[PDB]
């Protein structure tokens, strides 16, 4: 389709990861204050 492949990737799982991911690539993702 387009770039509408976002789908929860960039928000929900960040601060804590409940379900994991398939092969996290994530060069760097989470920032902490």
């Amino acid at each position: 389709d387009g770039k509408g492949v976002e789908m929860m990737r960039d928000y929900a799982n960040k601060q804590l990861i409940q379900m994991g991911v398939k092969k996290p690539e994530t060069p760097e993702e989470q920032q902490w204050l």
Binding site: D1, G4, M7, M8
Partner: protein, 51 residues
């Protein structure tokens, strides 16, 4: 110069711009929607379809 040539035809399954075969399929079947809590809203993302 490349990085352009963004536009050409994809030959293969007939799937059109918005959600023909990728969404669901035409051949001998019924009753797709499965069970899940986020699959509610992720099902909301499914069917917006055409521009």
């Amino acid at each position: 110069i490349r990085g352009r040539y963004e536009c050409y035809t994809d030959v293969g399954p007939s799937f059109q711009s918005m959600k023909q075969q990728n969404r669901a399929e035409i051949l001998e079947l019924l009753g797709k929607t499965p069970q899940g809590t986020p699959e509610y809203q992720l099902l909301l993302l499914q069917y917006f379809t055409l521009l």
